[model samples]
Target: LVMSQSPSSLAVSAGEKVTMSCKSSQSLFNSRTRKNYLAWYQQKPGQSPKLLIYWASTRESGVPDRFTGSGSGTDFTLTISSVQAEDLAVYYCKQSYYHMYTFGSGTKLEIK
Candidate 1:
């Protein structure tokens, strides 16, 4: 399935609230399983992506509380309550609801 992200890139100052969006060509929720197959990740330059949220809105272990995930089906959102300097990185949304899990284009966060 195809995935897309909004803004593609963002520029913001520290301590600001930020919201990024992810959209799928098809539904990412499994009605039988009662779960959304979407996930969110954070990737810094040259580093492997780190899991931020899974099952659509469940945060991964050790992930900061400032990061949040929401939405379902074909639309999902990843929000940061307060942006920090360290939050300047690429954010991606992925889905595992189909035969192959695909990733979105990703939203690059820039310090400004």
Candidate 2:
């Protein structure tokens, strides 16, 4: 499964909510479960990628609740309830469909 992210980059002030979208080349939603096999991650400069949300909308362990995931099929959304100076980083979305896994190009967040 192949996926793409939009805008490439976005600038936001601290405390603002950030929303990013990811689209898959093909559908990854399972009709039986009515859920999407998607995940969101954040990577600060010089740091490893950290899982934020997975299975479309569930936050990973230890991840702050500000991050959110939504949507299904080829379209998915990643949202941050509030932005902080420390939240400046690159965000990514991934898709899983049985045997195929793909990641978005990335969205770089910049402080305004």
Candidate 3:
């Protein structure tokens, strides 16, 4: 339970800042390096997980900038700015702490 998503639901207006939580059961941060190795993805029905944001908050190239991610340790947050209608999907977080890649339960974001 190092990386687990929360609040399976939410509302939206103009795709403005809507927040979702991705709490880790364990710390994903490195003690000496003091950095977090994490990634955020969006999954749509009938398709595989899509990389929206990764490395905690770095947006992947070719991916829209609306999706934002941040945080370290055991708590993280993903916020989609100016949400769009097509962005309605399930978002998940992945952690690479201790070389063990883990994914959260996933947070479902709907464009409503």
Candidate 4:
């Protein structure tokens, strides 16, 4: 599925709430698996990307609860409940429907 991320970039102060959007060209929910074949990743400067959320809304182990993933079908969103300086990074949305997978361009978050 073709993935698209919105805002591309944004600035926010600590404690602020942040939301980013990701869209796919087709449905990402898998009927047989009963899951959304989507994942959210975060990449800090000079570091390899790390998974934040998977199967749409399930937070990856060790990921903070402040980070959330939601939505289905062709629309999806990643929301930061309270933005922090440590949260500054590039966020990517990926779809793993079928055997094909693709990543979004990513939304960059920066400190204010």
Candidate 5:
């Protein structure tokens, strides 16, 4: 599977929001489970990655709804609303619904 980002980079102001896109060469939906096994993570500076979203658009338990995900087949979007100081990080979109899992190259959300 192939993954790509739009604008190749992005800038967001404090308290503002932004959306990142991810696309693949094939469909991620699983006919057996009837669900898209997509996952998203945030890698903060000097820390391990954190799971923010999973299963297409299902927010993980305790995760804020402001972090939303949507899309299907080969295209997806990850949105962060009200960017905070701690929200600065690289976001990734991953697909585990099929063999050979993959992740987006990584989108650097910058504060400007």
Candidate 6:
């Protein structure tokens, strides 16, 4: 099974990179398939969702190298370094281990 975070109020400094974490209720390594991968996404203001990170720590195609992901098992972190104007959005962490999935509550990176 997968688990995710609920909506929560968050804010970040303009130039600061922020990280959000997601954890599984069970061991992700114990899963039975390659689908046990993790991914990250960004929801821009008034726009469709975009994939940023995938397969644990690998950035998706065309994604900036500044965006990084790390961790394994049940702990993961999505980090955005040197935030840009276009980087402002709600970030989500998702795990596709096994047939189950889970998403993080999301951390809002805003100019402060």
For model 4, residues 9-83, the per-residue Cα lDDT tens digits are 999888899899999998988788899988999999999999999999999889989998999988999999878
Candidate 6 segments exceeding 4 Å error:
2-7, 30-36
- By TM-score, the better pick of 4 and 5 is 4
Candidate 4 clashing pairs?
none
Writing each residue's lDDT as its tens digit, candidate 6 over 44-98 gives: 9988779888877888888988899887777777777887877878888777665
Worst 10 residues of 6 by lDDT: 27-36
Sequence-dependent TM-score of model 6: 0.80
Report the C-alpha lDDT of model 5 over 1-112, residue by residue, as the tens digit. 7777665677878989898888877788887887777789989998888989887799988888889999887788898889887787888888886567888788988788
lDDT of 4: 0.91
- Estimate the TM-score of every prediction: 0.97, 0.91, 0.85, 0.96, 0.90, 0.80
Worst 10 residues of 3 by lDDT: 8-17
Ordered from best to worst lDDT, the candidate numbers read 1, 4, 2, 5, 3, 6
- Model 1, residue 27: C-alpha shift (Å): 0.7
> How do the residues 1-112 of candidate 3 rate in per-residue lDDT, one tens digit apiece?
4566778777676547788988877777776766777888889977999887766878888887676788877788988888888888888888877555888888877665
On lDDT, the candidate that comes out on top is 1
Tell how far residue 2 is off in model 1, in angstroms.
Answer: 0.7
Q: Give lDDT: candidate 6, residue 38.
A: 77
Clashes of each: 0, 0, 4, 0, 0, 5
After superposing candidate 4, which stretches have Cα over 4 Å from the reference?
A: none
Better of 3 and 4 by lDDT: 4
Candidate 6 CA-lDDT value: 0.73
Name the TM-score of candidate 4. Answer: 0.96
